[PDB]
Ligand binder design. Structure first.
Ligand SMILES: CCOP(=O)(OCC)OCC
Ligand SMILES: CCOP(=O)(OCC)OCC
Ligand SMILES: OCCc1ccccc1
Ligand SMILES: OCCc1ccccc1
Ligand SMILES: [Zn+2]
Ligand SMILES: [Zn+2]
Ligand SMILES: [Zn+2]
Ligand SMILES: [Zn+2]
Lengths: 330, 330
């Protein structure tokens, strides 16, 4: 009935236009507190985020799902501050990404489940803020630990109704492996979003997962190093496929009849310490619209390509509400 | 003239009997704040630490150097709380151990230097507490990143006068490689302590480093899985050499004339999340004296073996004061 946000619970109808895979900051556990100057200052980072969120709001965005986990250096207090200042709802996450420290890496599936349940039911750290989604990741074949992470995520999802969203090496078809693990735990595909899906041109892989009930996250739309092939680091991160090429996969999926399974986002950020120094500068040059990229550029583009405005609204409003709403299996 | 502690600066003479390589808690960045229940509770951990520190104080210990770095999940506020409650001085550290997250791993030697300088000159996080030692580590041949870490540590040491202490895979003679890097940066051996040195039976390796001016840290004295060969995990961590065997290396070094280069400790802890679950229980069974092990057991043992009480006092009081005192090279 309600979705947990960093400012408290909201009703489903209050979500409105939602970006399902974003980040205020891409960092590491403890980093922001230990070396804020890496980002100018904590203040500068917050202001930058507020400005970006306000521009996105101007464009129609009401809610963003920040999928930063503990290992992504998620700072809920920062999230709460920025949500209040920008007047944009922000859903926080639990789960683990691909940079877990030893204290996490050595845990059993049972312990990991407890930790995820903690963040969802009790609250994150001592803030009382509860997570509204579980984030997991693989980058090719799952490691044995990654397998434990996926099982624990499925278990926490099963107990709480909270959805699961993932990071994948799409080109390697990681989605297939994740699905298999989740299913083995009895999790329903409809509670799972297979992210970074636009990173691949293989529609056969995407339609196959969609046919099974999975949500497909087309969240790297503005990710492109075209014009910067000069830059190896940027190139390795963003790829050389155009934003138009990525956006067209959205239309392809709709054309195949999977409009109800699609989730779109930018996978944007305002700070990024987990990569080469100065990567943010490069990114901001590439996509000055930041998180407003989807509503300002993608939507109109799709409309122009023949996608009905109504369909577009269902993808940006309806689908997310259905996904985000905590749902227990019968 | 003064040494920085978690409660502020103290004069050299206020240090007294000091344990140079200890930890209040062995964890990971952000862990303690995110999952305190892993340790019962934050409160339970603090009480346990206070009780342990008070017993150590009863035995004569005045100061402990907590060598937990950011990646060891160092929580200075915890350190400050416990120092106040137990009335034991605690010196905090900067540096990096062997579990750095991506945000650290991707940094240049120049950036790393800035971060260490920050913690030493400005303060840790927003606490205003300044580090009094720089901790570094290798576990066999240094990785390229570990090499950057050692150079940055040497640079921060050179600028501030603060000593450097290390973690080594003694059996692999890591000390040799560390020394070479430090020397290449122009750091004086007398500002460096090569730790976990009692982990090896090779006196030739130890006397060689001592001859060069390095301080030798014999800090794993009570580390022993004898009686627990049954337990693979404990065995891999503690080894099967007796505490007596380790303690005798202290006497061997004194006999060779290196009394002024020796530093002794327990490498103890009150909480430990970076290993198998329940490892603390095993450890507490092995050494119920915890940090009081050195004064209660080792000292008398050495005395019995013919080491003059005066020599022992110089090792536990004098050597540490000389090491800890910030010293700029001429
Ligand atoms: C916060 C996540 O960073 P990535 O997953 O993608 C960046 C937008 O890869 C970073 C190493
Ligand atoms: C806090 C450090 O832990 P270790 O270096 O030695 C434990 C006393 O190795 C732990 C993996
Ligand atoms: O109110 C703006 C939300 C929205 C804008 C454009 C297309 C679909 C949904
Ligand atoms: O006051 C006790 C300090 C100390 C105790 C025993 C041997 C050397 C030093
Ligand atoms: Zn991702
Ligand atoms: Zn992401
Ligand atoms: Zn160590
Ligand atoms: Zn240690």
């Amino acid at each position: 009935d309600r979705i947990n946000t960093v400012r408290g619970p909201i009703t489903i109808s209050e979500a409105g236009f939602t970006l399902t895979h974003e980040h205020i900051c891409g960092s590491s556990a403890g980093f922001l507190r230990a070396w804020p100057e890496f980002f100018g200052s904590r203040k500068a980072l917050a202001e930058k985020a507020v400005r970006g969120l306000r521009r996105a709001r101007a464009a129609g965005v009401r809610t963003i799902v920040d999928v930063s986990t503990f290992d992504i250096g998620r700072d809920v207090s920062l999230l709460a501050e920025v949500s209040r200042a920008a007047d944009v709802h922000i859903v926080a996450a639990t789960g683990l990404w691909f940079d877990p420290p030893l204290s996490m890496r050595l845990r059993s599936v049972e312990e990991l489940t407890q930790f995820f349940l903690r963040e969802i039911q009790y609250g994150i750290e001592d803030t009382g803020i509860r997570a509204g989604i579980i984030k997991v990741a693989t980058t090719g074949k799952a490691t044995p630990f990654q397998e434990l992470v996926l099982k624990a995520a499925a278990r926490a999802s099963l107990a709480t109704g909270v959805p699961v969203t993932t990071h994948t090496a799409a080109s390697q078809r990681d989605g297939e492996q994740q699905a298999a693990i989740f299913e083995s735990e009895g999790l329903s595909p409809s509670r799972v979003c297979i992210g970074h899906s636009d990173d691949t041109d293989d529609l056969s892989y995407l339609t196959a997962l969609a046919a099974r009930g999975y949500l497909i996250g087309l969240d790297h739309i503005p990710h492109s190093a075209i014009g910067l092939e000069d830059n190896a680091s940027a190139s390795a991160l963003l790829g050389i496929r155009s934003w138009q090429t990525r956006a067209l996969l959205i239309k392809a999926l709709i054309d195949q009849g999977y409009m109800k399974q699609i989730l779109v986002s930018n996978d944007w950020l305002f700070g990024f310490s987990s990569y080469v120094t100065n990567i943010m500068d490069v990114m901001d040059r590439v996509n000055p619209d930041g998180m407003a990229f989807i509503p300002l550029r993608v939507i109109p583009f799709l409309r122009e390509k023949g996608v009905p405005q109504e369909t577009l609204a269902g993808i940006t409003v309806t689908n997310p509400a259905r996904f985000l709403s905590p749902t227990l299996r019968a």
